[PDB]
């Protein structure tokens, strides 16, 4: 799916990854935390919060 960073984000742990308000993210799974999505960016993959992004199913 398609994802779009809405606000800037700064990872807090090893399993999370950063972005900046505007990144085009690759949603690689979403079934484990209603509040987080696993997506791809910048040659990495990690958790990001859903209230910081907007999907584009």
């Amino acid at each position: 799916m398609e994802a779009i960073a809405k606000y800037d984000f700064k990872a807090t742990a090893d399993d999370e990854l950063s972005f900046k308000r505007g990144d085009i993210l690759k949603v690689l799974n979403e079934e484990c935390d209603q509040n987080w999505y696993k997506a791809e960016l910048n040659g990495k993959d990690g958790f990001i919060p859903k209230n910081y992004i907007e999907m584009k199913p």
């Binding site: 606000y7 742990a13 209230n51 910081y52």
Partner: peptide, 10 residues
């Protein structure tokens, strides 16, 4: 001012 990030870790 962005939103309060969810508590990660269910």
């Amino acid at each position: 001012v962005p939103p309060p990030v969810p508590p990660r870790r269910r």
